[PDB]
Design an enzyme around this catalytic site. Structure first.
Site, short mmCIF file in Angstrom:
data_model
loop_
_atom_site.label_atom_id
_atom_site.label_comp_id
_atom_site.label_asym_id
_atom_site.label_seq_id
_atom_site.Cartn_x
_atom_site.Cartn_y
_atom_site.Cartn_z
N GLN A 105 0.86 -1.21 0.00
CA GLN A 105 0.00 0.00 0.00
C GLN A 105 0.89 1.25 0.00
O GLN A 105 0.62 2.17 -0.80
CB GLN A 105 -0.99 -0.01 1.16
CG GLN A 105 -2.18 0.91 0.90
CD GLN A 105 -3.10 1.04 2.08
OE1 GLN A 105 -2.72 0.76 3.22
NE2 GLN A 105 -4.32 1.45 1.83
N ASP A 108 2.52 1.65 -3.42
CA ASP A 108 1.39 2.09 -4.28
C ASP A 108 1.19 3.60 -4.12
O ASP A 108 1.16 4.32 -5.14
CB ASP A 108 0.10 1.40 -3.88
CG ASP A 108 -0.98 1.63 -4.89
OD1 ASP A 108 -1.48 2.72 -4.95
OD2 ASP A 108 -1.27 0.68 -5.63
N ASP A 110 3.16 5.85 -3.10
CA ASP A 110 4.33 6.60 -3.64
C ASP A 110 4.15 6.80 -5.16
O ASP A 110 4.55 7.86 -5.68
CB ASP A 110 5.65 5.87 -3.36
CG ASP A 110 6.89 6.76 -3.47
OD1 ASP A 110 7.02 7.48 -4.48
OD2 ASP A 110 7.72 6.71 -2.54
N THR A 184 4.09 11.60 -7.97
CA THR A 184 5.26 11.41 -8.86
C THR A 184 5.45 9.92 -9.15
O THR A 184 5.49 9.14 -8.18
CB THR A 184 6.50 12.02 -8.21
OG1 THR A 184 6.72 11.26 -7.02
CG2 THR A 184 6.30 13.49 -7.91
N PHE A 186 8.03 8.45 -9.92
CA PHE A 186 9.31 8.04 -9.30
C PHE A 186 9.04 7.51 -7.90
O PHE A 186 8.15 8.07 -7.18
CB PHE A 186 10.30 9.22 -9.25
CG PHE A 186 10.56 9.80 -10.60
CD1 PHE A 186 11.23 9.06 -11.57
CD2 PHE A 186 10.08 11.06 -10.94
CE1 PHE A 186 11.44 9.58 -12.84
CE2 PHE A 186 10.29 11.57 -12.22
CZ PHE A 186 10.96 10.82 -13.16
N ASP A 188 10.08 7.82 -4.68
CA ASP A 188 10.78 9.03 -4.14
C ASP A 188 10.14 9.52 -2.84
O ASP A 188 10.27 10.72 -2.55
CB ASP A 188 10.71 10.17 -5.17
CG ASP A 188 9.30 10.58 -5.55
OD1 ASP A 188 8.34 10.00 -4.99
OD2 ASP A 188 9.16 11.46 -6.43
N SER A 190 7.27 10.44 -2.15
CA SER A 190 6.31 11.55 -2.37
C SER A 190 5.19 11.42 -1.33
O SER A 190 4.63 12.45 -0.95
CB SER A 190 5.78 11.61 -3.77
OG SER A 190 5.44 10.32 -4.29
N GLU A 258 -6.40 6.30 5.89
CA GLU A 258 -7.46 5.42 5.33
C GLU A 258 -7.58 4.16 6.21
O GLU A 258 -8.72 3.64 6.35
CB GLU A 258 -7.18 5.07 3.87
CG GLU A 258 -8.17 4.07 3.29
CD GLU A 258 -7.77 2.60 3.35
OE1 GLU A 258 -6.58 2.31 3.55
OE2 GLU A 258 -8.66 1.75 3.18
N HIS A 351 -5.13 -5.86 -2.43
CA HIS A 351 -6.50 -5.93 -1.82
C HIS A 351 -6.82 -7.38 -1.39
O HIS A 351 -7.52 -7.53 -0.38
CB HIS A 351 -7.53 -5.29 -2.77
CG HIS A 351 -7.30 -3.82 -2.95
ND1 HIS A 351 -7.88 -3.08 -3.97
CD2 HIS A 351 -6.55 -2.94 -2.22
CE1 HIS A 351 -7.46 -1.82 -3.88
NE2 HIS A 351 -6.69 -1.68 -2.78
C1 HEM Z 1 -6.69 -1.97 4.47
C2 HEM Z 1 -6.00 -1.90 3.33
C3 HEM Z 1 -6.43 -1.13 2.13
C4 HEM Z 1 -7.52 -0.32 1.94
C5 HEM Z 1 -8.57 -0.01 2.99
C6 HEM Z 1 -7.48 0.14 0.57
C7 HEM Z 1 -8.42 1.00 0.03
C8 HEM Z 1 -8.31 1.55 -1.22
C9 HEM Z 1 -9.21 2.49 -1.77
C10 HEM Z 1 -10.44 3.07 -1.12
C11 HEM Z 1 -8.77 2.81 -3.02
C12 HEM Z 1 -9.42 3.79 -3.99
C13 HEM Z 1 -10.52 3.02 -4.72
C14 HEM Z 1 -10.98 3.71 -5.98
O1 HEM Z 1 -11.58 4.79 -5.88
O2 HEM Z 1 -10.78 3.23 -7.13
C15 HEM Z 1 -7.59 2.03 -3.23
C16 HEM Z 1 -6.86 2.12 -4.37
C17 HEM Z 1 -5.71 1.42 -4.52
N1 HEM Z 1 -5.17 0.52 -3.71
FE1 HEM Z 1 -5.84 -0.02 -2.02
N2 HEM Z 1 -6.43 -0.40 -0.05
C18 HEM Z 1 -5.74 -1.17 0.82
C19 HEM Z 1 -4.58 -1.88 0.64
C20 HEM Z 1 -3.84 -1.85 -0.50
C21 HEM Z 1 -2.72 -2.63 -0.75
C22 HEM Z 1 -2.10 -3.59 0.23
C23 HEM Z 1 -2.31 -2.34 -2.02
C24 HEM Z 1 -1.16 -2.88 -2.72
C25 HEM Z 1 -0.25 -3.70 -2.20
C26 HEM Z 1 -3.21 -1.39 -2.54
C27 HEM Z 1 -3.13 -0.82 -3.79
C28 HEM Z 1 -4.03 0.12 -4.29
C29 HEM Z 1 -3.86 0.78 -5.57
C30 HEM Z 1 -2.81 0.63 -6.61
C31 HEM Z 1 -4.87 1.60 -5.72
C32 HEM Z 1 -5.10 2.56 -6.89
C33 HEM Z 1 -4.48 3.93 -6.48
C34 HEM Z 1 -4.58 5.03 -7.57
O3 HEM Z 1 -3.74 5.12 -8.49
O4 HEM Z 1 -5.51 5.87 -7.60
N3 HEM Z 1 -4.14 -1.11 -1.60
N4 HEM Z 1 -7.33 1.27 -2.13
CA CA Z 2 6.43 9.11 -6.02
#
Ligand code: HEM
Ligand code: CA
Ligand code: NAG
Ligand code: NAG
Ligand code: NAG
Ligand code: NAG
Length: 595
Positions: A105, A108, A110, A184, A186, A188, A190, A258, A351
């Protein structure tokens, strides 16, 4: 085949390509094209976007429009039928700690954030999306299927607002709609320092020339620092307990609170900065704030790259680590460092690694109080459980001695995220992250499963039995075929995550390829990559090569027992050693000699 383009933010940025420091925004990383990997630009498209109407409308928007001649299933129906499960027994990853999930997370946050349309306004609050569940203009509600419990309880839909796009505009015609990356590209930190000048400075302690980040004035953790509160309203962290009234934290990334274990890992990263600054200051007291800020930020940035590339990616990508990320052979200015749209979905594999409960453990790694174990849903936007229930030490111990959820074809996403997610403004623990991921796949114009299989040079199943062979699962295949009709129509988030895990990895081949490529590019395409000749002295890198997550904890908590390998499943005390046994960060090679 080629156009000219439109300009979303400040068009250019005077670069000052003497500065040895990353900009805050990521601009000036690439000299030929200084916008590349800079925040508040379009995500990269590895494949042309696929919209209902070719331009902007998601597949599923218009009922009579098919995809390849078949209706697209409702996101929540896919969620209920494939993603859901009841029994949390036996679901835990026997060889990944809960920190494995958490670092995912962090990384992600970053790399990518695609905010929903206009983060400069709440208008037009008609509202109406959440109330009357009526589709239109960036209101794209997740409708419940017949026989959904949530029907009975919550209304006809879960609200959902379409992601922002360039040019930073509501009405748009001509070219394919492109979502914004607000951080960013990168790696980094952020998420610690921010991605806009505005938030970078508000985060800093300028009031003193020590180059420190601001800290909580209103509360402390055994004298150790907390992030400062966001004194913005409406505070969802206030909303989840109006008695406690303890607000969300302020961090480089707005998602920081969050959940309590993300807020936790943010707290650890901040302390490291302040610790690193105070250390540098002693060694070099001639350095002003700016110089300490930047030199700490620069070291923190390296720590994240190394824990990510040396510790995390090998146990995500497994066998496929070598195939996609061969060892570093130096900065390449021709590599595109931008985060792709598809990555922002591939990385949501995390997730299925989130378990149903969080533990607070004491110094014997045993239950902290009579409420040691809490359901995950009660820990969304929950800061008061840190501030008034033992600070982060009990929570960090749980990240070490508890396990991630193991991804499971019959047990994909816990009902804590799949039924009980809290979203700010929407009052209830009643949302579904799986359904939101799928809706967002379509929102972002994602090409389907087979398009991406072809991209990664993998077979493209067309039949049930074809998909049975690729998923190595008769019944999961059958459910997907029943819902989607063709493998070509399967949304990449669920398609990618349905594939059995590669040897020594936690993602299938498709995701291994999509992830591996992105991580390859943000590394090779980064001018300020920690291992790049000239970024760090040769001695500075012998010092950096020894950092661990085990060390970060020792230096930034009162935890005195850690594992050596923090991402592996670790049992106390058998796999625990004293903090004394752990390689330290030797800042000797940062000793600067002058007037
Ligand atoms: C309790 C743990 C977590 C919660 C409550 C959570 C919740 C969320 C929520 C609410 C979003 C935005 C959903 C949307 O509007 O599309 C999101 C996006 C995301 N989550 Fe999670 N997440 C969790 C854990 C993780 C983990 C462990 C990863 C990766 C290892 C992850 C990767 C991502 C990614 C890549 C996005 C898209 C971000 C973007 O570019 O906008 N999340 N997550
Ligand atoms: Ca970054
Ligand atoms: C800034 O630094 C000083 C210590 O030098 C401290 O007392 C003060 O609280 C800091 N302010 C913030 C908000 O961090
Ligand atoms: C709110 O926090 C208080 C202490 O601040 C705690 O005793 C109480 O149970 C909390 N209530 C809820 C619903 O979290
Ligand atoms: C940089 O990467 C590009 C492809 O993205 C490749 O054509 C080239 O071999 C690389 N350049 C150098 C100098 O290694
Ligand atoms: C745990 O992690 C990695 C591979 O997943 C490896 O170093 C070690 O053998 C694993 N131990 C197990 C599976 O018990």
């Amino acid at each position: 085949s080629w156009e000219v383009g439109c300009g979303a933010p400040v068009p250019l940025v005077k670069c000052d390509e003497n500065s040895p420091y990353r900009t805050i925004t990521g601009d000036c990383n690439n000299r030929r094209s200084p916008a590349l990997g800079a925040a508040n630009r379009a995500l990269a498209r590895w494949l042309p976007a696929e919209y209902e109407d070719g331009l902007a409308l998601p597949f599923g928007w218009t009922q009579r429009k098919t995809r390849n001649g078949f209706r697209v299933p409702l996101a929540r129906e896919v969620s209920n039928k494939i993603v859901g499960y009841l029994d949390e027994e036996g679901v835990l990853d026997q060889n990944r700690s809960l920190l494995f999930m958490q670092w995912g997370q962090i990384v992600d946050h970053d790399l990518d954030f695609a905010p929903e349309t206009e983060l400069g306004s709440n208008e037009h609050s008609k509202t109406q999306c959440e109330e009357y569940c009526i589709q239109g203009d960036n209101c794209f509600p997740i409708m419940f299927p017949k026989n959904d419990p949530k029907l009975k309880t919550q209304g006809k839909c879960m609200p959902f607002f379409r992601a922002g796009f360039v040019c930073p505009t509501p009405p748009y015609q001509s070219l394919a709609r492109e979502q914004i990356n607000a951080v960013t590209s990168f790696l980094d930190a952020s998420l610690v320092y921010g991605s806009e000048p505005s938030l970078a400075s508000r985060l800093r302690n300028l009031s003193s020339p020590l180059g420190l980040m601001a800290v909580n004035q209103e509360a402390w953790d055994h004298g150790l620092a907390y992030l400062p509160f966001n004194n913005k309203k409406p505070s969802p962290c206030e909303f989840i307990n109006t008695t406690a009234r303890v607000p969300c934290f302020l961090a480089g990334d707005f998602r920081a609170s969050e959940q309590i274990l993300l807020a936790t890992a943010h707290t650890l990263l901040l302390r490291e900065h302040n610790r690193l600054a105070r250390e540098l200051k002693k060694l070099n007291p001639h350095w002003n704030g700016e110089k300490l800020y930047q030199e700490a930020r620069k070291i923190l940035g390296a720590f994240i790259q190394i824990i990510t590339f040396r510790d995390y990616l090998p146990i995500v990508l497994g066998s496929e680590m070598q195939k996609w990320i061969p060892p570093y052979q130096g900065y390449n200015n021709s590599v595109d460092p931008r985060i792709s749209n598809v990555f922002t979905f591939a990385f949501r594999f995390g997730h299925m690694e989130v378990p149903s409960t969080v533990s607070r453990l004491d110094e014997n790694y045993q239950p902290w109080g009579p409420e040691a174990e809490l359901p995950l849903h009660t820990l969304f936007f929950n800061t008061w459980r840190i501030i008034k229930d033992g600070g982060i030490d009990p929570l960090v111990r749980g990240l070490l001695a508890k396990k991630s959820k193991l991804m499971n074809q019959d047990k994909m996403v816990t009902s804590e995220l799949r039924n009980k997610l809290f979203q700010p403004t929407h009052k209830i623990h009643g949302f579904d992250l799986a359904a939101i991921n799928l809706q967002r796949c379509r929102d972002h114009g994602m090409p389907g499963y087979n398009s991406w299989r072809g991209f990664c040079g993998l077979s493209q199943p067309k039949t049930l039995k074809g998909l049975q062979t690729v998923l190595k699962n008769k019944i999961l295949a059958k459910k997907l075929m029943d819902l989607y009709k063709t493998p070509d129509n399967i949304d990449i988030w669920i398609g990618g995550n349905a594939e059995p895990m590669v040897e020594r990895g936690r993602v299938g081949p498709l995701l291994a390829c999509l992830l591996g490529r992105q991580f390859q590019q943000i590394r090779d395409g980064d001018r300020f990559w920690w291992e790049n000749p000239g970024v760090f002295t040769e001695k500075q890198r012998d010092s950096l090569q020894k950092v661990s997550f085990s060390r970060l904890i020792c230096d930034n908590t009162h935890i005195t027992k850690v594992p050596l390998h923090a991402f592996q499943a670790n049992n106390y005390p058998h796999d625990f050693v004293d903090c004394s046994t752990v390689d330290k960060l030797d800042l000797s090679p940062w000793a600067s000699r002058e007037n």
